[model samples]
Target: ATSTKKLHKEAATLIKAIDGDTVKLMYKGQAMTFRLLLVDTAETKHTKKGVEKYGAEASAFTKKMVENAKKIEVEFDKGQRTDKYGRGLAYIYADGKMVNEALVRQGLAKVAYVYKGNNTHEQLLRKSEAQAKKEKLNIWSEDNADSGQ
Candidate 1:
């Protein structure tokens, strides 16, 4: 029998989008850093490597989604709750849609970090990522590397 219980989840307010894959949120009475599950967007900046291609666009897309959404929520799966850095791991929801998958659908993120229990949304994200790759959107585009500085 399939379990119908809802996933562990919490409502949150947007403090800011830290990057394409990360956000700082106000949950309950405290602020916490959260990273989206099952996806990795291009890095806007790395301490040593600097910016990656399409990083700015990824960040801008996340910012727009979080900023414009009227309601935000986070859902945690059954596996590890926090990353090594202590940031909460979750699937972000904005206005009832999964923001994590949205990033993949838009070709801004790749399906990554597919741990056992955290694979709750893996299929969903992977499907979108496949479509994005096939369509060659943004990060998957052939010309993105040479088009800009």
Candidate 2:
């Protein structure tokens, strides 16, 4: 019979991400995997070929953000849940903090515009990006300025 109860999982630490937004969660009841929603970072070696600019920095930054953690909250979307790769699109919360926002706050990922629909923290993501741009951080730095160059 199908289980009616929503299965809650717990992870000891968030291991390195296989890609920009996907991570392998080491949970108690078997390992549960999760994906950060609404944001995309640069590609790593384990990721698809053809690296984007600043890809290494993005991956490294994300890895440092969640290297060690006792627990994390996983909230999933409905319609556009999993991608073709089968990664569940989710808003990850660690130690009562939003991981997605942290990535953008640290300039690891840009503010992804999803005109199709709004995620739980869409506004916050946009604001973080705006602040980063204003401060000229990382990809927004004057050196990396994109003037159609």
Candidate 3:
């Protein structure tokens, strides 16, 4: 089930693309990192392990997006705040499209449903996952795609 909720409409600057699902950025000039909302790509650089399969592809995709972007806007879900590691959670927008949704829609990532009361677009993000699944896109395909990485 996907969400039809509207975006939070907040603004932020783009910094380093930390991987397919994370970034280095800030609000009002304070430096911070944001773990992307909803979807999670495979691990690239982990704290204690090597890269997972499809991890490099996901990282390349994110870097392409981050570097090519002229602007990256972020919208935090209502009431949901930072995670335990103090990483900011958010849905990102670049060039007027939701980067969060695009990652799922384009098959670069998988659905990571972190539903709290504040996660407003779970429905829509899930729908993107369904479409990717139907198309056997990236992580959805077992034989030729990611092994649920």
* Candidate 3, 1-149: lDDT as tens digits: 44855654455676777777787765778768877777786665565443344566776777678668767777777635686778878777776777767777887787776757455677888899889888977767653645687
Best-first order by lDDT: 1, 3, 2
Kindly list the per-residue Cα lDDT of model 1 for residues 2-25, writing each as its tens digit: 686686456678778887678887
Clashing pairs in 1: none
lDDT of 3: 0.72
Specify the poorest-scoring 10-residue window by lDDT in model 1: 44-53
Candidates' TM-scores? 0.83, 0.70, 0.79
Q: How far is candidate 2 from the true structure (C-alpha RMSD, Å)?
A: 6.4
Runs in model 1 lying further than 4 Å from the true structure: 1-5, 44-51, 143-149
TM-score for candidate 2, please give it.
0.70
In model 2, what lDDT does residue 97 have?
66
Residue 142 CA displacement from its true place in model 3, Å: 2.2
Clashing residue pairs in candidate 2 are: none
C-alpha local distance difference test of each model = 0.76, 0.63, 0.72
